[PDB]
Design a protein around this ligand. Sequence first.
Ligand code: HEM
Ligand SMILES: *[C@@H]1O[C@H](CO)[C@@H](O)[C@H](O)[C@H]1NC(C)=O
Ligand SMILES: [C-]#N
Length: 439
Amino acid sequence: TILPLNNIQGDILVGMKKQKERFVFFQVNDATSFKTALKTYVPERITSAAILISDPSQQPLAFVNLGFSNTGLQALGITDDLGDAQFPDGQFADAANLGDDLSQWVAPFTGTTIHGVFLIGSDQDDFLDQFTDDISSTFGSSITQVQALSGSARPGDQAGHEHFGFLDGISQPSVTGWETTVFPGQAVVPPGIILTGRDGDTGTRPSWALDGSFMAFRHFQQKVPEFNAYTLANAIPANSAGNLTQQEGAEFLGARMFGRWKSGAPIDLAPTADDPALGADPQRNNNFDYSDTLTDETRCPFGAHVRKTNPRQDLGGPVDTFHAMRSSIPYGPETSDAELASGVTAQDRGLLFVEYQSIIGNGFRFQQINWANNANFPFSKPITPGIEPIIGQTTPRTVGGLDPLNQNETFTVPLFVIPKGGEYFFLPSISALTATIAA
Ligand code: HEM
Ligand SMILES: *[C@@H]1O[C@H](CO)[C@@H](O)[C@H](O)[C@H]1NC(C)=O
Ligand SMILES: [C-]#N
């Protein structure tokens, strides 16, 4: 198979990887007018995977992708069943299943009023704003913006790190069907794990859904002073290499919870001390599979974030089914010295989380429910893994094995990641946007 890179919305396969990103959530007021606008908007603004892999000199100043919710498709008279079990009812209806405290959800996510989302990526606020205004001007009264969420990469040497301080965007699956660099330890999967209607997709798709994908969008608020305070209060006293200062034990505890140091160094490779050079090297920072630690937790806890969401050899070998692409961006201001000192969040900050897969229930939702929320996953371990400390939602939020020298000790971890809303979207192919959606 040869993937038509010019026809696939770029954030799905390649990722915008821009310093700024805005999500404009909208409702359709006038289907006919919206469709008319779409036919001129799409060819001019919707960014393909082919554009994203081009030299920067060949790229526009901002990228735009576009997804629709179930109610958005219904509002546009697009009535064919896309074959996904969760997409039709929307994410609010699924939130309890994910483990969400529904009382923390906020409008306009508390229902299915949202019809779609424009995602705009740019390296600068000016261009982001201009392309946002271009949407407002092009579509006019045919849509109503019901929310806009804006994110930004963190400053300086924290660029690419999320708000707890950890380098993000290291490990992604690679799909066959196009020419790309594959790093050591990177999963290689058929394209239909990500793209609807391609090899590996087992869902029943309308023909027009070929080369689309489903986005699981999550708006997470993060409690950074609280996380920091918790790591200090529960600092690991020692590891194999020797005794730790409190600061060292706190840093180590954070790395044990994630499965990576803040630098990106995976603990399975660097189990006792950070290796920042390793973290920054894509030829090495993903080259592990837990095969050296299947039945003990010295090198990595069973319930660490990355291990829960991608179990690697904990599944007994390579498995295609549960991989997904991520294209998230942090939002909010840096955490001040006063905030960290108090141990109390004073400002709104977090992660605008984006995960793509052909089958919602096998990607995001499997990682969340079957794995992160499941105290007995990974399976067949000598010590109960417990609840994934970062995003596991089951209470009590108890996780074992964080202390490599006292692996039977359990940690009850306050929730530092608060879901504020989210939605399930379908991003069609570029041709489908104009030939089907706008028909
Ligand atoms: C605010 C919430 C979250 C934060 C701060 C966070 C942070 C991180 C970090 C620091 C990494 C390591 C970088 C990497 O390996 O690429 C990571 C990896 C990952 N996360 Fe999250 N994450 C969050 C939520 C989620 C959720 C909700 C899911 C899915 C249910 C998820 C799934 C994954 C996956 C699949 C990986 C890559 C694992 C691998 O391939 O080894 N994350 N995350
Ligand atoms: C390690 O810490 C313990 C206290 O937990 C202390 O008794 C011991 O002397 C320390 N060892 C070294 C080599 O500093
Ligand atoms: C995880 N992103």
